[PDB]
Amino acid sequence: NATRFASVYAWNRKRISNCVADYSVLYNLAPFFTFKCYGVSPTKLNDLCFTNVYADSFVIRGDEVRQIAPGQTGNIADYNYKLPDDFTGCVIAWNSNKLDSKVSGNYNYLYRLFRKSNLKPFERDISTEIYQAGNKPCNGVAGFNCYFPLRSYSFRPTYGVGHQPYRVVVLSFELLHAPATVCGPKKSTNLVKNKCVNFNFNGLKGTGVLTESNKKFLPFQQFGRDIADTTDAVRDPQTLEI
Amino acid sequence: EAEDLFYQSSLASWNYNTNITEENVQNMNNAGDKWSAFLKEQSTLAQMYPLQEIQNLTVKLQLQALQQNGSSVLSEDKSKRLNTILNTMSTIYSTGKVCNPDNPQECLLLEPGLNEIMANSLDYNERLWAWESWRSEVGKQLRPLYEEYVVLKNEMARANHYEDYGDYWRGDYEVNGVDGYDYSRGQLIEDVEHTFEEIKPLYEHLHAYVRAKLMNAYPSYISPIGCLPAHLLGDMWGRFWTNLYSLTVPFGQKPNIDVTDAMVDQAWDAQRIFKEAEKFFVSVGLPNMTQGFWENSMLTDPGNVQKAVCHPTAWDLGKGDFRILMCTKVTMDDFLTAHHEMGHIQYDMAYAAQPFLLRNGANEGFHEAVGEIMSLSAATPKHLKSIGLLSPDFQEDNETEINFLLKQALTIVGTLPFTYMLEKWRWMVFKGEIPKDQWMKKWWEMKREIVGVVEPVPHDETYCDPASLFHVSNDYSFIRYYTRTLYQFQFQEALCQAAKHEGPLHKCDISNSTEAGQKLFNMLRLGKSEPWTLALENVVGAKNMNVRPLLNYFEPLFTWLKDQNKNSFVGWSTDWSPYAD
């Protein structure tokens, strides 16, 4: 929900690490236009955690939304950015008609259509180099047989869907050998007392009868044991009650 | 950089066509000079291109449209002179005042005046002043204007390595660089002459059918043997013969096929016109509707406080923006041009990933011939019964299909010798084959032999007769209309060959079939990256221009035109004249 976005070749970095992500108000509410991705489903992210998550904020044309795919090549997927074959995360797009544009075309943000070579995935390429495919040079100026790929956008809300301003948030999921830090939301149920019931806690599994406890407890502990090495107290995962 | 400077210019023309104010005429100019500066700051940097070493065909098709220097090869006073005479010759056609020489106290204007007098007038002498005074008051000063114009464009063509200016309109059809699919610039001359020989019995049976039914209206004005007087063709020149349908109706007791009476009682609007007709495109296999087409286009004339020109055109603005502009009315003919003008805009929807030099048709007539195949497939009884607009049990016999065939005979087949008569004349005035005293004498001599029309008043060299049209007075191409029909019948045959319909081609229907979608969409997405001689082989299988589906379209008509003209005279002669008294 950013007010200012970055360019499509000037991708910024916002770290998502050591936190809990709540997708019950973002993905389940869904204020965006389209919701589709490959690799994983959006109903699989609630019980799956990863090590390091990255994201960005950039607005493309509407015809360039088909180039954002793993293994895709084209005018944007081979010259502006690249998605790798092992891309785990998902891509969410939403139209941004009147707030991200201006009158007579949004000439604030630019995009590169030609590059001198094929780029790697995660390349923040903001250079002003010239693609060459001829014989003679031009001494570094936009002149004879020398392309100038830097040209601004033309966003305005009275236009069609072919270059409608679509705010695309490419959220990149990545699992490593480090343990996971960012995990999705998960609903909870009510608690019952004075009954032999099953326990599915955050860090304790078993069965028994939950009664009131008059024992001392710590705010960081999960469970307690007696002298006979069995569980006799559990702290609430949502709250704190032993 | 051409996706921004032309896009600022062409949106000002869309803003001028929507809102006509005094601040909007200059809005096209100040955003329009930067595209004309970019058209010359790129073309002077594209003159030293080595075309002897580039092997890429996708690059070299882009550089052929950039190597053309344009109209600024010559000197500074002549580049001022071409900017001077071009806006002069279009202002006098738009603001031309013509009236009767007997009573000049009332003189009206162009568009409400001349249009009504060719529709329902039956008088001989009163309609004769409507055709003669337009050629005697507007076209008198064109002969000092066109004589220096015909020497201006010949010097533009010799420095750009052409033969003459007749090869400039044929330069868009030139295909070079591919072995086996070569097409010379002079190959279009003998191709037009070869395609006319199959339609020469087709027009001669149409020439005898019009004159035999017009014997009852004009007993002592039209000969049974000779040619046609020029002031009774139902049009200003003879391009559209649709207004002569009330005089050449085959059976008046048979009802016409129309949904004008069926559209009023269901309370249809202009929003329901483009919504039901968009279901024709998704059922074939084309992609869906864009949202900028709906909430931003002008289908309803916005009140009487502001003027807006709503002539039907599809505005290919740029970068994937698609807009249409017409005043949609509740009739039969406005629904067919709603099918036609969005057939151009779905052709432009296919090559959205192609660049600016490849975002065009394969020639100058490819963009309009691919739009009429949905308009021909919308007036069929198979489509109109499936949408529920007609009767659920409507009678269809052999006699009511002739009345549908004459709706496609008058406006399509009738302009094709008139397209041949003008474009052979325009090719030979720039080549210098005729002198100044034979400049206008050759025009009605070639008119009397190939279309069968004789002027009732003799015109000297001080009048300019073919420049009263819209395309001659604005310096546009006229060879696009001859291959407009030949491409729209080769497409409409070959698309519903895969739709497994057994019957005639006028009863064929490409909807409710996805076999014609994938056979079309790989041809629509090519654009100028592939030439037309290889894109034709993917659909119809023929790289050459042939007249085979045009003979099979009117094959019930060519049987009936043979049997009705057993007593009539086939052909014409160069002896009869209306002024020979």
UniProtKB/Swiss-Prot annotation, chain A:
Glycosylation sites (chain numbering): N1
Reported impact of K102T: In strain: Omicron/BQ.1.1
Annotated ranges, domain BetaCoV S1-CTD: 1-185
Phenotype for F148L: Increased resistance to neutralizing antibodies and human covalescent sera neutralization
Substitution effect: A133V: Increased resistance to neutralizing antibodies
Effect annotated for changing L26I: In strain: Omicron/XBB.1.5, Omicron/EG.5.1
Disulfides per UniProt: C37-C90, C49-C183, C138-C146
Consequence recorded when altering H177P: Increased resistance to human covalescent sera neutralization
Region annotated Disordered, chain positions: 113-148, 177-199
Annotated phenotype, changing L110R: In strain: Delta/B.1.617.2, Epsilon/B.1.427/B.1.429, Kappa/B.1.617.1, Lambda/C.37, 19B/501Y, Omicron/BA.4, Omicron/BA.5, Omicron/BQ.1.1; Contributes to cellular immunity evasion and increases infectivity
Result when mutating L110R: Increased resistance to neutralizing antibodies. Decreases HLA binding to NF9 epitope. Increased binding affinity to human ACE2
Subunit: Binds to host ACE2. RBD also interacts with the N-linked glycan on 'Asn-90' of ACE2. Cleavage of S generates a polybasic C-terminal sequence on S1 that binds to host Neuropilin-1 (NRP1) and Neuropilin-2 (NRP2) receptors. Interacts with host integrin alpha-5/beta-1 (ITGA5:ITGB1) and with ACE2 in complex with integrin alpha-5/beta-1 (ITGA5:ITGB1). May interact via cytoplasmic c-terminus with M protein. May interact (via N-terminus) with host bilirubin and biliverdin, thereby preventing antibody binding to the SARS-CoV-2 spike NTD via an allosteric mechanism.
Protein name: Spike protein S1
Gene encoding the protein: S
Portion held of the full protein: 343 to 584 of 1273
Curated annotation (Swiss-Prot), chain B:
Resulting phenotype, R185D: No effect on interaction with SARS-CoV spike glycoprotein
Annotated phenotype, changing E41K: Increases slightly the interaction with RBD domain of SARS-CoV-2 spike protein
Listed result of changing H205Q: No effect on interaction with SARS-CoV spike glycoprotein
Extracellular compartment residues: 1-581
Annotated localization: Cell membrane; Cytoplasm; Cell projection, Cilium; Apical cell membrane
Effect of L57P: Increases slightly the interaction with RBD domain of SARS-CoV-2 spike protein
Record domain Peptidase M2: where: 1-573
Post-translational modification: N-glycosylation on Asn-56 may limit SARS infectivity. Proteolytic cleavage by ADAM17 generates a secreted form. Also cleaved by serine proteases: TMPRSS2, TMPRSS11D and HPN/TMPRSS1.
Uses, biotech or industry: An engeneered stable, dimeric and secreted receptor with combined mutations that increase the affinity for human coronavirus SARS-CoV-2 spike protein shows potent SARS-CoV and SARS-CoV-2 neutralization in vitro.
Effect caused by changing Y7R: Increases slightly the interaction with RBD domain of SARS-CoV-2 spike protein
Effect on the protein upon substituting L325 to K/A: No effect on interaction with SARS-CoV spike glycoprotein
Outcome, altering D316A: No effect on interaction with SARS-CoV spike glycoprotein
Residues reported in the UniProt entry to bind substrate: R239, H311, P312, Y481
Active site: E341, H471
UniProt-annotated glycosylation sites, renumbered to this chain: N19, N56, N69, N288, N398, N512
Cellular component terms (Gene Ontology): apical plasma membrane; brush border membrane; cell surface; cilium; endocytic vesicle membrane; endoplasmic reticulum lumen; extracellular exosome; extracellular region
Effect caused by changing P355A: Slightly inhibits interaction with SARS-CoV spike glycoprotein
Keyword Cytoplasm among record annotations: yes
Phenotype upon changing Q8L: Increases slightly the interaction with RBD domain of SARS-CoV-2 spike protein
The protein's Enzyme Commission number: 3.4.17.23, 3.4.17.-
Effect of P355D: Increases very slightly the interaction with RBD domain of SARS-CoV-2 spike protein
Subunit-level organization: Homodimer. Interacts with the catalytically active form of TMPRSS2. Interacts with SLC6A19; this interaction is essential for expression and function of SLC6A19 in intestine. Interacts with ITGA5:ITGB1. Interacts (via PDZ-binding motif) with NHERF1 (via PDZ domains); the interaction may enhance ACE2 membrane residence.
Domains: entry comment: The extracellular region of the ACE2 enzyme is composed of two domains. The first is a zinc metallopeptidase domain (residues 19-611). The second domain is located at the C-terminus (residues 612-740) and is 48% identical to human collectrin. The cytoplasmic tail contains several linear motifs such as LIR, PDZ-binding, PTB and endocytic sorting signal motifs that would allow interaction with proteins that mediate endocytic trafficking and autophagy.
Name this polypeptide is given: Angiotensin-converting enzyme 2
Native organism taxonomy: Eukaryota, Metazoa, Chordata, Craniata, Vertebrata
Gene: ACE2
Residues of the whole record sequence present: 35 to 615 of 805
